[PDB]
């Protein structure tokens, strides 16, 4: 779920408040269309796509699915006790968190005008 995703971030990118990723570019956050403004936004476009794919599994709701994972000593691990839906969402979240860590944060791209720049 988002709570857990929030925690994955704070664990892979402790230097930042998860809030910095909650509304960035065209895909990080409520957004979900248009051209990604930079590599970090692309991290979120991939994440969104991943969620849409996951939504294909019956009863699978990626914002709300509570999965099993661990983050310690810099490593994120989606545990073996996850069903197809949990494993899939956890993997979406784990890959995005990792992408976030290695992506440059461009202050200019925070909270942009979606209706005007993400068509
Ligand atoms: Ca999104």
Curated annotation (Swiss-Prot):
- EC primary class: hydrolase
Predominant cellular place of this UniProt entry's protein: secreted
Alphabetical list of InterPro entries matching this protein: PLipase_A2, PLipase_A2_Asp_AS, PLipase_A2_dom, PLipase_A2_dom_sf, PLipase_A2_His_AS
Q: Copy out the cofactor comment.
A: Binds 1 Ca(2+) ion.
Q: Which Pfam families match?
A: Phospholip_A2_1 (PF00068)
Where in or outside the cell is it found? Secreted
EC number in record: 3.1.1.4
**Gene3D superfamilies according to UniProt:** Phospholipase A2 domain
Q: Which PROSITE patterns match?
A: PA2_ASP, PA2_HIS
Q: Which UniProt keywords apply?
A: Calcium, Disulfide bond, Hydrolase, Lipid degradation, Lipid metabolism, Metal-binding, Secreted
Q: Among its keywords, does the record have Coiled coil?
A: no
Q: Does Hydrolase appear among the keywords?
A: yes
Report the family membership. Belongs to the phospholipase A2 family. Group I subfamily. D49 sub-subfamily.
Q: What does this protein do?
A: PLA2 catalyzes the calcium-dependent hydrolysis of the 2-acyl groups in 3-sn-phosphoglycerides.
What this protein is called in its record is: Acidic phospholipase A2 3
């Amino acid at each position: 779920n988002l709570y857990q995703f929030k925690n994955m971030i704070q664990c892979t990118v402790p230097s930042r408040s998860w809030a910095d990723f909650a509304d960035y570019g065209c895909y990080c956050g409520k957004g979900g269309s248009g051209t990604p403004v930079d590599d970090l936004d692309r991290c979120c476009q991939t994440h969104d796509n991943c969620y849409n794919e996951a939504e294909n599994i019956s009863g699978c709701r990626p914002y709300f699915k509570t999965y099993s994972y661990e983050c310690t000593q810099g490593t994120l691990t989606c545990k073996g006790d996850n069903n197809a839906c949990a494993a899939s969402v956890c993997d979406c979240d784990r890959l995005a968190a990792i992408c976030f860590a290695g992506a440059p944060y461009n202050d200019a791209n925070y909270n942009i005008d979606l209706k005007a720049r993400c068509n």
